[PDB]
């Protein structure tokens, strides 16, 4: 990924229903289709080669996957906030937990997050297009 991918804030558009990933100041995570929603502007940070954290800019919190597969957002970049970022077949990205290595960040067609343990590499739910 080129430097601009990290420098410019992104909205993460999920292929599964067209929901943008939304991170809230209370720690909640969900999805919304409205592009002007104030809590869908995210910052991708290169933590290591191929590894990112995902910060909700307004929320001032980082996306975390918990040990039971839930998505929340933390004030600090804990070990639950590191994700392998990978490019898939139609140029959407996936985000796989560095801690729970079989589980992906994902949104259901209902607009709520999909439990990590119910995700998989071939699901539409795990595909996100970073948009400006």
Ligand X SMILES: CO[C@@H]1O[C@@H](C(=O)O)[C@@H](O[C@H]2O[C@H](CO)[C@@H](O)[C@H](OS(=O)(=O)O)[C@H]2NS(=O)(=O)O)[C@H](O)[C@H]1OS(=O)(=O)O
Q: Which residue's CB is nearer to ligand X, number 62 or number 113?
A: 113
> Which residues are bridge partners to 97 per DSSP?
83
Please indicate if the annotation marks 90 as binding a ligand.
Answer: no
Q: Which residue's CB is nearer to ligand X, number 59 or number 105?
A: 105
> Which residues are bridge partners to 23 per DSSP?
29
Q: What does the DSSP assignment read for 2-24? A: -HHHHHS-BEEEETTTSPEEEE-
Interacting positions 59-118 with ligand X (CB under 6 A): 108-109, 114, 118
C-beta of 111: minimal distance to ligand X in Å? 9
Distance CA 24, CA 42 (A): 11
Asked if 58 touches ligand X (CB under 6 A), the answer is no
Q: Which residue's CB is nearer to ligand X, number 16 or number 53?
A: 16
Within 10 Å of residue 110's Cβ, how many Cβ atoms? Answer: 12
C-beta of 7: minimal distance to ligand X in Å? 30
Q: Which residue's CB is nearer to ligand X, number 55 or number 114?
A: 114
Using a 10 angstrom Cβ sphere, with 0-12 exposed, 13-18 middle and 19 or more buried, the burial of residue 23 is buried
Interacting positions 9-28 with ligand X (CB under 6 A): 16
Residues that bind ligand X (CB under 6 A): 16, 108-109, 114, 118, 123-125
């Amino acid at each position: 990924f080129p430097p601009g991918h990290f420098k410019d804030p992104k909205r993460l558009y999920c292929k599964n229903g067209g929901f943008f990933l939304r991170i809230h100041p209370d720690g909640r995570v969900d999805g919304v289709r409205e592009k002007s929603d104030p809590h869908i502007k995210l910052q991708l940070q290169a933590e290591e080669r191929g590894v990112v954290s995902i910060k909700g800019v307004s929320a001032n919190r980082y996306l975390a996957m918990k040990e039971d597969g839930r998505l929340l957002a933390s004030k600090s970049v804990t070990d639950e906030c590191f994700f392998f970022e990978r490019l898939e077949s139609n140029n959407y990205n996936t985000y796989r937990s560095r801690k729970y290595t079989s589980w992906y960040v994902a949104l259901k067609r209902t607009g709520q997050y999909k439990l990590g343990s119910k995700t998989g590499p071939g699901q539409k739910a795990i595909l996100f297009l970073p948009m400006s």
